[PDB]
Design an enzyme around this catalytic site. Structure first.
Site, PDB file in Angstrom:
ATOM      1  N   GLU A 128       8.479   6.609  21.306  1.00 18.31           N
ATOM      2  CA  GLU A 128       8.913   5.402  20.620  1.00 18.31           C
ATOM      3  C   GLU A 128       7.769   4.697  19.907  1.00 18.31           C
ATOM      4  O   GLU A 128       8.025   3.969  18.949  1.00 18.31           O
ATOM      5  CB  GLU A 128       9.623   4.433  21.560  1.00 18.31           C
ATOM      6  CG  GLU A 128       8.771   3.852  22.621  1.00 18.31           C
ATOM      7  CD  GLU A 128       9.553   2.963  23.545  1.00 18.31           C
ATOM      8  OE1 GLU A 128      10.780   2.825  23.356  1.00 18.31           O
ATOM      9  OE2 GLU A 128       8.936   2.405  24.465  1.00 18.31           O
ATOM     10  N   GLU A 180       8.194  -2.654  32.012  1.00 12.77           N
ATOM     11  CA  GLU A 180       9.462  -3.017  31.388  1.00 12.77           C
ATOM     12  C   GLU A 180      10.351  -1.798  31.184  1.00 12.77           C
ATOM     13  O   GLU A 180      11.581  -1.914  31.213  1.00 12.77           O
ATOM     14  CB  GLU A 180       9.162  -3.749  30.073  1.00 12.77           C
ATOM     15  CG  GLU A 180      10.322  -4.425  29.344  1.00 12.77           C
ATOM     16  CD  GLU A 180      11.104  -3.474  28.458  1.00 12.77           C
ATOM     17  OE1 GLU A 180      10.503  -2.496  27.968  1.00 12.77           O
ATOM     18  OE2 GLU A 180      12.309  -3.708  28.239  1.00 12.77           O
ATOM     19  N   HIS A 181       9.749  -0.629  30.974  1.00 13.90           N
ATOM     20  CA  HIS A 181      10.532   0.604  30.948  1.00 13.90           C
ATOM     21  C   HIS A 181      10.981   1.016  32.345  1.00 13.90           C
ATOM     22  O   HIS A 181      12.115   1.474  32.528  1.00 13.90           O
ATOM     23  CB  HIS A 181       9.728   1.722  30.299  1.00 13.90           C
ATOM     24  CG  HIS A 181       9.613   1.578  28.821  1.00 13.90           C
ATOM     25  ND1 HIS A 181       8.994   0.497  28.235  1.00 13.90           N
ATOM     26  CD2 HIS A 181      10.055   2.358  27.808  1.00 13.90           C
ATOM     27  CE1 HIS A 181       9.056   0.618  26.924  1.00 13.90           C
ATOM     28  NE2 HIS A 181       9.689   1.742  26.637  1.00 13.90           N
TER      29      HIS A 181
END
Ligand SMILES: CCCCCCCCCCCCCCCCCC(=O)OC[C@H](COP(=O)([O-])OCC[N+](C)(C)C)OC(=O)CCCCCCCCCCCCCCCCC
Ligand code: HEM
Lengths: 420, 55, 78, 53, 446, 101, 51, 292, 89
Positions: free
Chosen positions: E137, E60-61
């Site tokens: 993150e 997804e990144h």
């Protein structure tokens, strides 16, 4: 069968706007020109307590009756406030919006402002201010407005610390009696017919009809204020005076912020069409967030840059962002970039009005501003009528004008206005 | 520190019940009577105990 | 486009304050809480100044001097 | 009521002949009537007379 | 005028077609000039096998960092050029890649989405950069207390199953996974029959179907070894995790029981039960006149900073419960009052609070289905979970069939005498241990 | 009528709280509604009420009454607590009716 | 006692009738068992053998 | 910090220095609120090891002989390094902070850059301070020879207090006007005081007033060195600033050497200089720097 | 104070004669003008209003008033406000 927007201006000055789209949930809002700009130094923070005092006892329904009656049908009552405008919005099923309009119009037109109720509400005022200032952007924008303006738009949205415990019932009554008049009010309803809206309008607010108390013209002062508080990131906003609501130069400034960068479109993106982001990222490898800030009100506007950076690299990043705007002030731009900025601005406008509450806010703001609903296609063509020379003129108006700076964080390497 | 009357756990009960107890200033002699009852109860117990030594 | 939500894209919740008098059906994102802010110390009130005659001398004329002591109360001169 | 309790204490030490039966019966009836009926009615009358409601 | 019934029935229907690959193509048309077009994939952390626990998150990144046809940032330059917005998210069961754009830019957006699902070039330098990004993150995500508490609740409630492991995965897997694990995950879990192309707003269904035939045809359709994965049920465990750290100012506590799942209709009834308890935080203006008894007693006794109720549903399982944030010296009292409310809903539900909960649920559903993005989100989840888009009229029928007797029956089925999962984080010493909570899960007076 | 008014003045003198300087609303027993109405009072009436109560308790403590010129006369007995009490009572009836239905 | 005269209190009372009746059955059975009452235990078949 | 900030002119002086300087004089004397709970022991050790060194200290004794003081100096004060850290020269910015806190009295301070310690012009600035009023000389007096009090008092029927503020540091200076007034009449008090200083700057002054200001300055110095604490503070300040002891007769001689044209030059330097403003109170009628 | 009054001048030594006759001008030949009496009456009334908010002065005045009852040592140096309103020349 969705019809169009339909408008009547009543002879006491009240604007009525309706749209019947047969939505299952219908939304009715009421918009007053009673923001925080209409206070002075003697009644600061009164609009914050007025915003938080929407569930108080009214002449017609108590606090218990209002709260339990709105929650009984599952409806929602909310208050949104800017520096110019207040908006009280109710929403619910079409079969209960009659009593929802009863509650909302009682809250707008006939408050009581009992002293024990506001004495209980002042602690909630402190709690709401703390929750609002939990993030750095809110404090730095309030500081930026306070250093940018002298009298009107310098008044904070949130109540000052000394004024808590000092706001009385008489100040709230005076503010309501001087700014909640029919010539400053628009009643806007999505999902409701025109007849029921206009009849509840003529049988609720038939007692006040004047122009109210006129506010002072906002005066620019400029300058800078710095808040050293030891945060990990330095926040800095540098703005100048810009166009107001009702000019094509405001459209030029909106195109200018969408050229410079007005938020990421991709999750965890690099902002490769943002000129400020590119100019910072070609020199600094630290994490950063640089955007363009624009806030325009009916007499004056602020346009500038907003930066979040590391404390050690806070300086040149700001300088890099400033230098990029100077390049736009020198005509160094391409027509494809301006076309992409126009597409971004018009897509942002259409996605802002695609939701129901955003549509109602847009209709209420337009009805307060002009009394008529401007169609979106004319907004699109007036965005498309902006030239490149207007963008260059807006950039040179920003770089030539005197600055207002609000900075916060570890400001040991944050530059000053004369060093720029 | 040395305010034992309000720090000792036994002595603070007697303090809170009989020394620093806030009482109304205007109570008449009728409010004496219940205290008399407690004392009279003690008297009964004591006399009864000695009456239990030979009965 | 005459609205702060339509013209200021990312800076919509910082130019606007939205409270709820009666909560809706859907809970708002970022509920938030106040993590028990500290109490300022309680100090005795200073006398006011209601005449010119006692206001005379209150304006500063010298740089700020602070003084603390082992058994002397702290003082400041102007 | 206190006077009636004194009368009942006197009657309790007397044997059952005339007129102690009827005096004790009227005393007990008046005792229960004063406690259960007459005192709240009197309090309501006092609240009327003091213009409370 | 029109009442609620024909206003709900005047909503346009969501029309679904299917390609030869088994790819679902669903759309709902409105009068808006904008649209939201997304791809929903039945692939999450539940399909990962502890050796690739962060593959979906890290893909997804990587999915927006360039494809084979559109190398690098030129790709995102395209989604800047039309002014469109590009978003993606991943849950434990579903992954979504969605674009908000104008209507007239409908073809290229679909083409862009096609690249994102089948042409993503996973460069190794980009893999290292996104590995550092994911590490930092997580280093900011563990500061947010409610995400930590809900991850702890999932772990202790679904111990030993693939539903315990987080979407992000552990940090060692972030330091460990290479390009070949991502390629294997991409070739295993991005199959065409497990994909929905959902569109909401100003779109025509025939044009969208033609664009899906042009761009999204022949994704994989074949598992390449006749090795089909199978969904496995997850064992619920009544258990407790207590992360004590006394330096934090506030404590977050979540208590849940086992939920029914997506396909079980009494979810609707359970939602009404949640609407009876509701939510609260300290900025609510209702005061002491709030209809929820838990919120009223919290305001009256100054107990909690916030609370909320949740009904998280997965494939035939879920977590149904409450999460509250409060200081230490209130925690036990909050637990007591919360449990009392649950037992009241098991024993003494009346018609007025049931009517209030039904009205709150009706408002919640219709107000949530507003705008192109939540409608497209609902279409994607409905085609992935139910296999069909449930219309709002059917939701209204299932709401109006709920009365007080079946609400207390279903609440006694799911709340009464059940072993809960408890997750606490913060100053949680006065948080009661498992016997006291388990004893509070029933009443001696019924 | 006038006879009822004269008898009510006679009963006011027979009640005897005017000899301690108390008003009518000072003698109300502090129930929940009465405490809420006291909490809703302005601070001047609140301070006057509690000074009158303190003086009455002091006079009862020394078993004396005020001088006859300092007695609370009948026509200056203002019912200060009565509208606040009516507000508290009416909103409690509204809450009771809502909980009843 | 006109505070508790409404449809909600009637519904609450109707809901709590069977639990109260079951508790009354528990109390009656416990009273008969503890006092060894001959008016009932002479009718229960297996209990008859101890008399 | 709470006890020190109990009165408003402390916060006014702190905000005024923070307005006036970018660095190295704008650091507050009292600890900021965020730094409480965060100052560590190694920061104190670093500050002492970098600033408490031998070339920056003077040991001054009253009532002791030189031999005892010098032997404890060689037995204690020989283990430190040298000149330590330098500093940052205290560059000037200017500006304005207005702190709206709704006080009944508005406190305002308008200051400009002046001469440093050791400059002769600073002495003239001191004379200019006593030309304008540096405090009362009578308990409950009218301040008849104070030019600021005479200029403001003719147009005010409500209480006020105006003085001249002087602050000389080793590399910088700050001369200005301090006003305390009502909220509704702050503007006329500030404008009257500023016009009085502007009239002084245009050569409108009397030589008798300059002589009276010199007498006030000499009497203030000789009363400041009257006590033993003030005497030892003066000796320590002189030893740190100049490395020598200057006699009071020489101090009075260089006070008497000041010309009145130097006072005019100091007032003109204040008038033409860039201003710095710190205000607090109900500032609805307090003017801005560009409005003066 | 309650027992002593002081008028004192701090000056230079060389101004010692004039200071002395200034003191001889103060305690001996004071002129008590009536408009000045009105102005200082108002000044003293509001200065006592200022002194009301200093709690240690109030407490020490209360201590003198309750420790020296019926004697001239109980009364304050400023006196009551009514005497301030009606003192004549
Ligand atoms: C000593 C051993 C028992 C200790 C108490 C105990 O465990 O009680 C069981 C439980 C409490 O222990 P518990 O925590 O196991 O309760 C579980 C309750 N259920 C199964 C409904 C979820 O007590 C009762 O249920 C009531 C016991 C008394 C019953 C009424 C009296 C019977 C005799 C009448 C004459
Ligand atoms: C625990 C403490 C007590 C003990 C041990 C006790 C013991 C006795 C004994 C042994 C007697 C018989 C001797 C006698 O006839 O005088 C007696 C008599 C009596 N007791 Fe107590 N007693 C106690 C407390 C009380 C109390 C509290 C009362 C009630 C006030 C009470 C009331 C009486 C009475 C009325 C008699 C009969 C007196 C008589 O007729 O001679 N006793 N008690």
């Amino acid at each position: 069968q969705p019809q169009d927007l339909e408008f009547t201006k009543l002879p006491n000055g009240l604007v009525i706007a309706s749209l019947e789209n047969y939505a299952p949930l219908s939304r009715i809002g009421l918009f007053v020109k009673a923001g925080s700009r209409y206070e002075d130094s003697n009644n600061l923070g009164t609009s914050h307590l007025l915003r938080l005092a929407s569930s108080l006892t009214t002449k017609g329904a108590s606090s218990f009756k209002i709260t339990r009656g709105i929650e009984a049908v599952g409806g929602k009552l909310s208050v949104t406030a800017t520096r110019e405008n207040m908006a009280y919005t109710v929403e619910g099923i079409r079969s209960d919006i009659e009593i929802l309009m009863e509650f909302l119009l009682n809250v707008t037109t006939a408050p009581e402002f009992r002293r024990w109720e506001v004495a209980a509400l002042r602690s909630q005022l402190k709690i709401d201010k703390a929750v609002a200032f939990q993030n750095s952007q809110t404090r730095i924008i309030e500081n930026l407005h306070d250093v940018a303006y002298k009298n009107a738009l310098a008044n904070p949205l949130y109540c000052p610390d000394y004024r808590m415990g000092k706001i009385t019932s008489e100040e709230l009554h005076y503010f309501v009696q001087n700014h909640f008049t029919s010539a400053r009010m628009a009643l806007v309803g999505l999902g409701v017919s025109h007849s029921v809206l206009k009849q509840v309008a003529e049988q609720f607010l038939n007692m006040r009809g004047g122009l109210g108390l006129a506010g002072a013209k906002a005066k620019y002062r400029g300058g800078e204020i710095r808040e050293q508080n030891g945060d990990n990131l330095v926040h800095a906003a540098i703005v100048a005076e810009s166009a107001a609501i009702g000019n094509a130069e405001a459209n030029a400034f909106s195109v200018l912020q969408h050229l410079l960068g007005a938020g990421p479109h991709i999750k965890r993106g690099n902002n490769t069409t943002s000129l400020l982001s590119q100019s910072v990222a070609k020199g600094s490898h630290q994490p950063f967030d640089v955007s363009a800030f624009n806030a325009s009100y009916s007499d004056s506007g602020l346009f500038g840059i907003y930066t979040i950076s590391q404390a050690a690299a806070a300086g040149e990043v700001i300088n890099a962002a400033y230098n990029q705007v100077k390049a736009v002030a020198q005509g160094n731009l391409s027509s494809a970039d301006v076309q992409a900025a126009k597409n971004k601005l018009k897509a942002g406008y259409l996605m802002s009005v695609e939701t129901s509450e955003g549509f109602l806010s847009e209709i209420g703001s337009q009805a307060l501003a002009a009394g008529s609903y401007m169609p979106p296609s004319t907004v699109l063509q007036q965005i498309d009528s902006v030239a490149d020379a207007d963008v260059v003129k807006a950039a040179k108006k920003f770089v030539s004008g005197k600055k207002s700076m609000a900075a916060s964080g570890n400001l040991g390497h944050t530059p000053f206005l004369d060093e720029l | 520190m040395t305010n034992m009357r309000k720090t000792h756990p036994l002595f603070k009960i007697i303090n809170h019940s009989f020394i620093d107890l806030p009482a109304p200033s205007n109570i008449s002699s009728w409010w004496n009577f219940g205290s008399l009852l407690g004392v009279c109860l003690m008297v009964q117990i004591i006399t009864g105990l000695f009456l239990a030594m030979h009965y | 486009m005459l609205s702060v939500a339509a013209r200021s894209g990312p800076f919509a919740p910082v130019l606007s304050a939205t409270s709820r008098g009666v909560a809706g059906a859907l809970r708002p994102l970022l509920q938030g809480a106040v993590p028990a802010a500290s109490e300022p110390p309680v100090l005795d009130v200073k006398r006011p100044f209601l005449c010119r005659e006692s206001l005379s001398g209150q304006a500063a004329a010298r740089p700020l001097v602070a003084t603390v002591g082992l058994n002397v109360p702290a003082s400041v001169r102007f | 009521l206190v006077a009636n309790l004194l009368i009942l204490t006197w009657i309790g030490g007397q044997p059952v002949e005339h007129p102690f039966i009827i005096i004790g019966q009227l005393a007990s009836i008046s005792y229960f009537s004063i406690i259960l009926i007459l005192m709240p009615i009197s309090g309501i009358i006092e609240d009327k007379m003091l213009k409370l409601y | 005028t029109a009442t609620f019934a024909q206003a709900l029935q005047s909503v346009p229907e969501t029309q679904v077609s299917i390609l030869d690959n088994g790819l679902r193509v669903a759309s709902e048309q409105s009068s808006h000039a904008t649209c939201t077009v997304g791809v929903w994939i039945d692939a999450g952390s539940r399909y990962e096998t502890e050796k690739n626990n962060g593959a979906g998150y890290f893909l997804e990144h990587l999915a927006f960092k360039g494809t084979k046809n559109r190398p690098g940032n030129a790709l995102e330059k395209e989604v800047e050029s039309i002014g469109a917005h590009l978003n993606a998210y991943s849950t434990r069961e579903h992954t979504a890649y969605l674009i908000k754009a104008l209507s007239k830019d409908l073809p290229k957006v679909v083409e862009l989405l096609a690249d994102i699902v089948q042409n993503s070039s996973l460069e190794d330098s980009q893999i290292e950069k996104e590995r550092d990004v994911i590490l930092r993150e997580m280093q900011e995500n563990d500061a947010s207390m409610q995400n930590v508490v809900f991850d702890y609740l999932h772990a202790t409630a679904f111990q030993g199953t693939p539903l315990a492991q987080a979407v992000e995965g552990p940090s060692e897997n972030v330091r460990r996974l290479s390009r070949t694990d991502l390629t294997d995950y991409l070739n295993r879990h991005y199959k065409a029959p497990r994909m929905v192309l959902a569109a909401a707003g100003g779109v025509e269904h025939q044009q969208l179907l033609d664009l899906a035939q042009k761009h999204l045809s022949s994704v994989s359709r074949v598992y390449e070894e006749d090795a089909v994965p199978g969904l496995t049920p997850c064992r619920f465990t009544g258990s407790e995790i207590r992360h004590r750290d006394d330096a934090l100012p506030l404590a977050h506590v979540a208590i849940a029981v086992e939920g029914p799942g997506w396909a079980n209709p009494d979810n609707v009834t359970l939602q009404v039960a949640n609407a009876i308890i509701g939510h609260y935080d300290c900025t609510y203006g209702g005061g002491v006149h709030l209809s929820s008894p838990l919120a009223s007693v919290a305001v009256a006794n100054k107990l909690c900073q916030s609370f909320q109720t949740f009904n998280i549903s997965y494939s035939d399982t879920g977590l149904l419960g409450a999460h509250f944030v409060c200081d230490a010296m209130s925690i036990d009292d909050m637990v007591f009052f919360l449990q009392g409310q649950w037992m009241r809903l098991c024993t003494s539900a009346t018609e007025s609070e049931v009517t209030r909960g039904k009205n709150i649920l009706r408002n919640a559903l219709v107000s949530h289905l507003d705008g192109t993005t939540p409608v497209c989100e609902d279409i994607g989840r409905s085609l992935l979970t139910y296999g069909r888009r449930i219309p709002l009229a059917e939701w209204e029928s299932r709401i109006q069939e709920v009365d007080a007797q079946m609400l207390r029956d279903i609440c006694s089925k799911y709340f009464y005498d059940q072993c809960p999962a408890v997750a606490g984080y913060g100053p949680i010493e006065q948080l009661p241990d498992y016997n006291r909570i388990r004893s509070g899960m029933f009443w001696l007076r019924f | 009528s006038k006879w009822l008014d004269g008898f009510r003045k006679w009963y006011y003198n027979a009640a005897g709280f005017n000899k301690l300087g108390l008003m009518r609303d000072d003698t109300l027993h502090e129930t929940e509604d009465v405490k809420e109405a006291i909490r809703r009072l302005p601070e001047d009436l609140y301070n006057d009420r509690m000074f009158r109560i303190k003086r009455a308790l002091d006079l009862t403590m020394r078993h004396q009454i005020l001088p006859k010129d300092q007695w609370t006369k009948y026509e200056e007995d203002k019912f200060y607590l009565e509208p606040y009490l009516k507000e508290v009572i009416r909103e409690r009836k509204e809450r009771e009716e809502w909980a009843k239905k | 006692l006109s505070r508790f005269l409404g449809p909600r209190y009637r519904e609450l009372a109707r809901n709590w009738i069977p639990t109260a009746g079951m508790w009354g059955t528990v109390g009656a059975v416990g009273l008969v068992w503890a006092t060894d009452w001959r008016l009932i235990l002479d009718w229960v078949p297996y209990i008859n053998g101890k008399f």
